[model samples]
Target: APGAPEGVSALSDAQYNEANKIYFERCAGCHGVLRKGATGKALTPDLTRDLGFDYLQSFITYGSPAGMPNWGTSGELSAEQVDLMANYLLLDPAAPPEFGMKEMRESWKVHVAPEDRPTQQENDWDLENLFSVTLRDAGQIALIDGATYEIKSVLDTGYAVHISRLSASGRYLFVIGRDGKVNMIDLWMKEPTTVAEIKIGSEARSIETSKMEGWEDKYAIAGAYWPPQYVIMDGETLEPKKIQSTRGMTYDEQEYHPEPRVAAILASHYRPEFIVNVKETGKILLVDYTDLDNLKTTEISAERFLHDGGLDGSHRYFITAANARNKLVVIDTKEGKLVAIEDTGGQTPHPGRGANFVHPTFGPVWATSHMGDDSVALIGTDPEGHPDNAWKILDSFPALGGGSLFIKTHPNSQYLYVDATLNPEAEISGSVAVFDIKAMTGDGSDPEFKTLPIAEWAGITEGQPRVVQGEFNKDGTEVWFSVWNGKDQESALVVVDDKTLELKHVIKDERLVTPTGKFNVYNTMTDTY
Candidate 1:
């Protein structure tokens, strides 16, 4: 290997263990075990060796053009640590072993039998308005009673749970972690507990249940980051029913794509098909689960790097952002055809369960925020109904800063909430932006907008807290925001009164460490993101 350090080929036992810990803690989230890229670029041995020790060290020390954090310069890691990371990346990586049906079935465990579980709401804690808040670094989930604004139970979950998806019947909750572990929670129980769990793969993000009319909660689907496949499981048992590989030819030119990893998994409300987005290949698959024994798929090609998105009000169309291509690809699920790809111009448009509301001028519009731009792009979705303004960018509202991750608005509320946790500036990143859709979307010169500094409001003065996801409560009377203060420190959830836009409560408790994203049971059940 060119520019390889002496004795680097054979790492000592202690050194190897330390490197593995560092990689898993800091690098594995974006870069996989195989060093294949997800949000970050691939760091294969050959590529790292070609870049050599010096170049790799400098890149790690100063960061890359791709917005990678400069760990060395930021003082998070020393120069020696940066050099060790470089050497670790250049070493021949360990292969992720086979995790087939036999292994999946072996690890599957149903804690409380279905016959033992509660059939209806056993307690009077307002189950519909309850919340499943993700305790990120703690590897746990706290079921909070939204009515009382208190924690009910802190149940152990998979490592760093990414998202908590509700079942179609609203009786069961499915939670998936970045480590590819899926847990099934029975909300009907006296205390929400994990009834069944299974490790799907090495990495995963999205999970959802069959939401169609007759097939509701009959089956569930989870998208994997490694091996480029998705697992179809028995909704109740969490047993692996079928596994489908997303790898195939590129939909644009039929070129072979070896690693077409699944990015997002969303079940359509109109049909029995699951809209699966392949990240690298830029292909969206409409997998028909109506006949799981003989599954059928309809593939549609859009643009590269297709990520998070949501449906319009009509539930007939699905829109996802192509951040790499700076475009928003809309697919008409009912028609089974590509609708349009509108240019966003901005960088890394990430619409985490995007907002759908009827704009005063453009009719029904879908809004998404950007990771690299400080604006929310609103696209006209009602083409057939509002053809004049459909599939076009009606307007983009300027935010405090770039790196906005999630934008949310309630169907019953008149305001929209957005978070810019990705922004480097604390003033902008540690706050939530508000916009009066009904008041500002019209042709008015003065717009009603405000930025609520949640960190300062939460009384955090020691370090800057990252404001992550903003979600609405059940009835849309209150909105919740998480003040994520990293792994070790304490975090808090700030609640706001929706009508007056005033700080309602700053929840700071011992159990609320590294609180990231939250999902209101009712909002999630009704598809209100």
Candidate 2:
């Protein structure tokens, strides 16, 4: 078959299949499956064929200073495996198989039936302060007691759980991995174990439950990257209920896009709808979950390559990033329309359930740090009273560096915490930039922040154990950041005093392998900053 360029190295059918699986599991999340690139650089064969096998292998072995993982150095991929992947990158990409209700049904498994689940809270653990830390390479999650910093239980999960979302009642925690496997964990379970599991696609990212008052957790939705579709399931048992394709035309180009992926999904507080952003098509969908047979979806046009985002302080406006376009698309969920599309000025606004705060001048605003630029952008979200500033980039501040995966704040805290774990630079990698929000001028000016000195504080070499994600506990007095390494090395959780900005605790554990994102039960349920 015609494949990679004639001068490029070729792989046998068996080797090609093996390398394809490896790339799908490890590389596809950043570099697109079609090699178009998002968070990572594009790997199109026309571009990568010139990099040569040796250079590609070396780069993959040691990783990059800009935050790519050290697949070989970290013992993630063996030397031979790394060589195989390097060669695979030069080959013309192959399209993955389609996944529909039939395939989804085959992958569904109910481990603990609803009838078998406990009726009431079974343990004395503080439900409000629980932290679900994704053990990425371990294919597990550590449910830690926030008050005592105790690992309550280490539950098996899908490989590399990207993010965890809490159910409306806060009884279930849903985590979807890049491999498209979704696990439903019963937080009320004495040990907090998986109640149901399903593979919605070969690759997936976003997942959320029906959170509106009366529809609370009645259904759950999982969006896929490979199949480019969204699946609705029974919120209790995770039974596959309906499947809808996200493939469509690009909003701006007016051309058909085969992989218009489901990027971010957020349940509306005021409506019985799930706000879904389609990545390639640049379309925001308001999917009403009121009826199953005649399902309704309102598509609002925006820029392409939609990614992570969060709600405004009012919880009525859902703001997300069209990272590739360097724009933030705001949607008024209550009014069911697009509010505005404003460029962040910086690049790639990645806000994993972003931060919300009352800016002195912007009133209430949502903030996100860029992956391409060393600055954080805050968007004015209060349109009712602060109409002049609403849906606009109101303030900007410099971060320690770029490649920030997450930024967070709390209603009770004065600081906005952000990390640049992707930066391989010595001083920037293992540090959390802490900004004093009150120090900012009332005229919407930027403020400088202090680095917590995490590398020195933890007595670790800079960049070896990188710092990422900051999640606040129940009352928001303490903030926790994951001190992450590869699966081969032990990782840690660094907790800081929200007020003092001092190192409060360093949580080291055997089970904390390659941790990334952390979700607090209380903040997640209430959709707090």
Candidate 3:
């Protein structure tokens, strides 16, 4: 009766379940349903223990003596409810298994030094693959079998694993070590080995390999420290032939430091390679990675776009819902340099209605916003300068802002999905809105979009929930989003069917306390058509 044993609680099954729901409704508002607090204090001690139960229950019910207020009365949740919440905290608190990876490295080896990895032992893999990167201390890599979606081999290549892919011949799957090592995993052999390793002079950010140049031999990557610089290399040796970068600017209208720069490499349909730079100066620099020897640069700036992503493999035009600068920037890619074109202004050929982060979805560059009062804007572009312009804010879903969190467009459907986090005091909870993009027009007037409110937590709670990133299945029938756990210690990856808007499954994982980050499933490998 005294909270059971040390690290354990004596709450009944019904009591635990009901309290869990209440905890999700109330505490989850700030702490998260996972008990991994995002906006609230994190659940530290192992919850399944007795002391853990007593500590949480006492603190929640009577409030921490220091700052936590008494929730026994005058709060949405009562004493009994808080006790139950404490019991739930004492639930499963064991460490999950290390997502098994070592078995999948059929064409690779990671435990050895880069220069000494076994090489030239050629064999063929099962033509199956899964590639992923973790921000964890030792970023892990998994190669999945295509048929079963099961991991075939795993490796820990000491560097911060940024991005990876299999070569065209399927004989090699390449990964770039954050320290600038171009690592080649030999997949063509019966027992995979680390075939080749080379240094490209800078911390590698993005890597791209293409066969468009009439040879099976050329590969390139766009690597940058702060302000970007890139190198062209021979695929077989990872040898750098030329280096290109955007450093000096003569523009009288713009003053920028070559600092805090981000780079991306896009392989276009009709060209060699399209490279870009995301700068703090609000400028996008374009360069041809294919011709790394004769690198040319062009700069374009439009309001502030916290994010500017590309659509599909052909990243000719950069897309963004730049709300700070109140516009969308679409930079054109040419052989030598990028051409800047602002699809902004109310009456212009293209309109950017204070877009937030323009996401690259399917064929069109999509965006959401809290523009002109409270509403979300949906802008689209063919990614090419079709109809003489790009980045047109075609429609806006009206709503009052806190901000729009997640945007997922159904692949084949005309309907668009977005999550809106309203300002505090609404007590209305955050809502996910759905709209029909085809029925909307680019005429400037905000359109009424339908909305669904996420269920509330049933006890004492604080801040509102925020949805971070999300992606849709190829058919657009389902969506998956990442929501922060109470604070920075935990997070939940929630999956929802696009049609019902109901949560199907959730992947709750604890995050690193100091090195926290966000993720997106949008990469060239998974995209089709």
Q: For each candidate, give its TM-score against the true structure.
A: 0.86, 0.85, 0.54
In model 2, pairs of residues that clash are: 67-422
- Sort every candidate by TM-score, greatest first: 1, 2, 3
Name the weakest run of 10 consecutive residues (lDDT summed) in model 1.
1-10
Provide the lDDT at 4 for model 3: 48
Best by lDDT: 2
Judging by lDDT, tell me the better candidate of 2 and 3.
2
**For every candidate, C-alpha RMSD to the true structure in Å:** 6.1, 4.8, 15.3
Following a full C-alpha superposition, what root-mean-square deviation does model 2 have from the true structure? 4.8
lDDT winner between 1 and 2, please give it: 2
Per-residue error for 137 in candidate 1, Å, reads: 1.0
How well does model 2 score by local distance difference test?
A: 0.84
Could you tell me the lDDT of residue 213 within candidate 1?
81
| CA displacement after TM-score superposition, residue 8 of candidate 2 (Å) | 15
User: Which of candidates 1 and 3 is the stronger one according to lDDT?
Assistant: 1
Give per-residue CA lDDT, model 1, range 288-343, as digits (tens). Answer: 88787888888898888898888888877888998888899999988787999998
